[PDB]
């Protein structure tokens, strides 16, 4: 599925933090460390960040190539299989809440525009691309992202075979 | 809803590891600690256990009371709200992969009867209560619970308003 392959390629890109062509725990370790240095947050949030981002690999991605590096082909091949069973979606969707927890640096349980902008910036993206993605997730227009909005949009990104506004969940498509 | 409420109360009973009437991070920490004692896995897995278990609280239950200890009624009402929007199911089911990762002490991506049994024993249940639940989960009778099998069963537990074989997912109902 064209657009669907394109979304996976995009996600792969954004999460391949060190850009070496393979998803590894190292990507999440480094992303966390940068995030902890450069963002404003509650002091205790630095540990949360590390646990939650590394937990993406530890509890989810580790199951893809059983322990090591995931190349772009294996990623797509793997996800392709994973989305097949409508009853096991949480294996694909599971990481959203962890991403959410890391991004909520003031731990108020909502993601604000500033927190989202910082997130895009951690992924190496131009902060000026955040609003279009934020806006797609903020369905009630209250100017915040609730856990519910975040997971619903993220779920759409991963699962929709067709075009939707959530195709830009992880920034601009490659 | 009567049975659903019963299941929620049962999940609540189970995770309230100390039995103080409140679910707190400490529950998971103490559970982590006892889990490690009861199994006799390799060193590297000890940390996995801790990380995985506390991760249930850190990323999922903290969304319930802004970080404080959750009482039974608060728990059930939250759950009632959470299960209403099926598109957001991952907030509820999100923890299953975490539990899986903790229970698979030999990091082989499968849960054996031994491993499952330690999990039950761990939770204050007698290992004879286990086989009942195992077999409900092992839908292809190959004597191993795969990640997919674990989350499908767990999801039925959480989401089925009606009776099903998976109501015993967390052991005998209270
Ligand atoms: Ca990488
Ligand atoms: Ca926030
Ligand atoms: Ca909103
Ligand atoms: Ca407790
Ligand atoms: Ca195992
Ligand atoms: Ca099986």
From Swiss-Prot, chains A, B:
GO terms for molecular function: calcium ion binding. Pfam families: EF-hand_5. PROSITE patterns: EF_HAND_1, EF_HAND_2. Residues 3-38, 55-90, 91-126, 127-160 form the EF-hand domain. Ca(2+) 2 binds at residues 104, 106, 108, 110, 115. Ca(2+) 3 binds at residues 138, 140, 142, 149. It comes from the Eukaryota. The modification N-acetylserine is found at residue 1. Ca(2+) 1 binds at residues 16, 18, 20, 27. Transmembrane segments: none annotated. Keywords: Acetylation, Calcium, Metal-binding, Muscle protein, Repeat. The keyword Calcium applies. The keyword Calcium applies. InterPro entries: EF-hand-dom_pair, EF_Hand_1_Ca_BS, EF_hand_dom, EH_dom. The sarcoplasmic calcium-binding proteins are abundant in the muscle of arthropods, mollusks, annelids, and protochordates. This protein has three functional calcium-binding sites; potential site 2 has lost affinity for calcium. Like parvalbumins, SCPs seem to be more abundant in fast contracting muscles, but no functional relationship can be established from this distribution. This is Sarcoplasmic calcium-binding protein. It comes from Hediste diversicolor. The lineage of its organism: Eukaryota, Metazoa, Spiralia, Lophotrochozoa, Annelida.
């Amino acid at each position: 599925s064209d657009l669907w392959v394109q979304k996976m390629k995009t996600y792969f890109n954004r999460i391949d933090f060190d850009k070496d062509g393979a998803i590894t725990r190292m990507d999440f370790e480094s992303m966390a460390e940068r995030f902890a240095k450069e963002s404003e947050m509650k002091a205790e949030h630095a540990k949360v960040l590390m646990d939650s981002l590394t937990g993406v690999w530890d509890n989810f991605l580790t199951a893809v190539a059983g322990g090591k590096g995931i190349d772009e082909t294996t990623f797509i091949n793997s996800m392709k299989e994973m989305v097949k069973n409508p009853e096991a979606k949480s294996v694909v969707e599971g990481p959203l809440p962890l991403f959410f927890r890391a991004v909520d640096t003031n731990e108020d349980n909502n993601i604000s525009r500033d927190e989202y902008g910082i997130f895009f910036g951690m992924l190496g993206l131009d902060k000026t691309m955040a609003p279009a993605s934020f806006d797609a997730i903020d369905t009630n227009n209250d100017g915040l992202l609730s856990l519910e909005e975040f997971v619903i949009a993220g779920s759409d990104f991963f699962m929709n075979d067709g075009d939707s506004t959530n195709k830009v969940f992880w920034g601009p498509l490659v």
